[PDB]
Amino acid sequence: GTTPGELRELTDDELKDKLRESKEELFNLRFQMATGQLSNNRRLRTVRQEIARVYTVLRERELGLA
Amino acid sequence: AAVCDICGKGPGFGKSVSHSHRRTSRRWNPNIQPVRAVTRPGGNKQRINACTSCIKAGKVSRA
């Protein structure tokens, strides 16, 4: 739901805030699926990829590639 | 006791040969001698295994 272009616009601290937010959303989704009340299975994959994106961007800024 | 610590002289391998010409493997060991060698004039000695050739050539020294 968020693209690498938009992520590169946020400050370092805003990215870390978004990473916590996504981890909380993933946690809620896992519980909803264990309870069997989650209709859209695909939200798990998308949230997980969103976490991976934020990590990638953060690492690029440390390595000086951005 | 078959390897010199200065020049690396190792044993040679060959054959002992009987009168009946039976060839059996044997070694030719270097003649290496324990020497209490020194490093500087009037210094502490250190035991090393030097071949007689190195002793004769003066590559080890004593005090």
């Binding site: 946690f27 953060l58 440390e62 | -």
Partner: protein
């Protein structure tokens, strides 16, 4: 970057008849990361759910072996955490009841 979160430890709730019977007693069962220990789980649970944890009990469970035409395969092993909440603490609304 590494941004550790308490929710990384607590993978899923356990849904079963025994688990519900424990929820009646204010005791909740979670699947947790195999490497986690009781103290880590206590800290994580109280941070996530903003609740006082009384005790945490744990148990390792070996995965079942199942036959196939292809041969024997093994399900994953898991670690369970039986978490008792302090008396006087708000119940957890996420197990689905």
């Amino acid at each position: 970057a590494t941004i550790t979160d308490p929710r990384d430890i607590i993978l899923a709730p356990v849904i079963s008849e025994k688990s519900y019977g424990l929820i009646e007693d204010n005791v909740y069962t979670f699947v947790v990361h195999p490497d986690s220990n009781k103290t880590q789980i206590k800290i994580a649970i109280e941070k996530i759910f903003d609740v006082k944890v009384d005790s945490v009990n744990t148990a390792n469970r070996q995965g079942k072996r199942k036959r196939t035409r292809t041969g024997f395969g093994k399900r994953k092993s898991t670690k369970r955490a039986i978490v008792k909440l302090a008396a006087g603490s708000k119940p957890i609304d996420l197990f689905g009841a």
